[PDB]
Amino acid sequence: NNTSGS
Amino acid sequence: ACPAERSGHVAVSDGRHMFVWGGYKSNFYLPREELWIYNMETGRWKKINTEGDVPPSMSGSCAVCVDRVLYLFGGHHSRGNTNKFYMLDSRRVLQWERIDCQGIPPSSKDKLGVWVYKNKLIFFGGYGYLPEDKVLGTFEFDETSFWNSSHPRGWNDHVHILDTETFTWSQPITTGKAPSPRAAHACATVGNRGFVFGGRYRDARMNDLHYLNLDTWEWNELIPQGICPVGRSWHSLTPVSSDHLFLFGGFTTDKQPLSDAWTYCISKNEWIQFNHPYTEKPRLWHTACASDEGEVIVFGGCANNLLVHHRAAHSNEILIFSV
C-alpha cells in the first residue's frame, strides 16, 4: 500500500 | 552506531549535518522517535530520540531544512496517506511541533516534492486520495487502486504554497502548461527556478524536465539538445551549484533499477553523464543531500525492484559523489 503510484 | 536499512525515508541537510527520519524496511516502518544525524565532514552517525508531537512512522514524506528548522509534510503510515505538517527545530531534547495551518491544505499525499523560496514552501504533485473540487489543478485516478484498497488513490499536478510567515496554505494561479500529474518525481530549487524531473504517471516513468518560475508562477518545459537520461521515478535530483543539478538512480518504466548519474547544466540546457565508482550500486527511493564540501551524499533506498517486497534489498549504505 505504501509503494503504489510510483 | 549505524542506522538500520530503509527506503522512503527523508533526509535533509544544512550542508554539514544530514538529518534522517522515517522510512520502512523488510523483516515495517522504522521507529518514529529516532532522528539519525550524519556528520558529512567526519562520516559518523548519532541517534537522537525526539519528543513532542512526534509524527507517525511514514514512508514517502516530504521534508526540507530551512535555517536548521526541519519541516515535514505528508507521507504514508500504516493507516494511509496524510496531509499533516510538522516542524522540528534542530538549532536539549528536540521536540516535534505539529502545526495548525490556516487555509485549505493539500490533499493527503505522499511521494511528492518541494521547492523552498524565501518565506514559502511550495509543494508539487504526489499520490493519494481524491481532493475536493475547490483545489486548482488536475487529479487522475490509479485504476489499480480500486481493487487493492478500501480508498482509491491517484496522481495530482497540484501546486500549494505554505507561507511560513503565517503558516497559511494557498494556491498560486499559474500560466504555461504544468507537468502532467505525477508522483515519485524529484524537485530541486536554484534561484527562483523550481525544477522537476521525471516521475510516474499512468503507465510511464517519464523523462521530462520542467521548472516553475517562483516569482511569476509561469511553467516552462525544458528541451535539452542531445542525449537525455532515460525516464525514471524514485530518483534524486540535487542542486550542486548555481548552475548544476545532480541526478542519480531511480527506476525505469520497464522496472530496471538505475545506477547512472548525470549533471544537468542549467546555463547550457545540456545533460552530462557523470562517471562514478558505484555503477554496481543502483538505488531507488534513496535520498540525496549536497554538502558544503562539493559532495552529494546518497543514503538508503533499494538496490532492486522493491515492488517485489519479499526480495527487496533495502540499504543502509552511504554513497558519496564528488561533483
Side-chain angles (χ1 to χ4, degrees), chain A residues 2-6, chain B residues 111 153 155 200 205 234:
Chain A
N2 79 309
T3 58
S4 307
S6 62
Chain B
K111 298 188 288 287
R153 293 184 287 167
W155 303 274
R200 156 105 187 264
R205 299 186 173 90
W234 268 333

Side-chain angles (χ1 to χ4, degrees), chain B residues 162-176 178-224 226-228:
Chain B
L162 191 273
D163 177 348
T164 58
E165 300 180 351
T166 63
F167 285 112
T168 300
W169 290 110
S170 69
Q171 287 195 280
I173 296 285
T174 62
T175 67
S180 72
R182 60 190 63 200
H185 47 289
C187 288
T189 314
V190 180
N192 63 357
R193 293 198 188 179
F195 294 90
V196 56
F197 179 70
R200 156 105 187 264
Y201 170 63
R202 304 249 137 180
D203 270 326
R205 299 186 173 90
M206 291 164 309
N207 70 338
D208 55 347
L209 181 63
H210 305 252
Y211 78 89
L212 177 59
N213 187 311
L214 313 167
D215 283 338
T216 73
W217 308 114
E218 173 185 80
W219 274 112
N220 302 86
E221 198 177 350
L222 293 162
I223 316 273
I227 306 284
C228 292

Side-chain angles (χ1 to χ4, degrees), chain B residues 238-257:
Chain B
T238 307
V240 298
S241 81
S242 58
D243 201 41
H244 300 93
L245 311 170
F246 183 75
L247 170 79
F248 176 63
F251 200 46
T252 75
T253 311
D254 62 301
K255 309 269 173 333
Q256 165 168 189

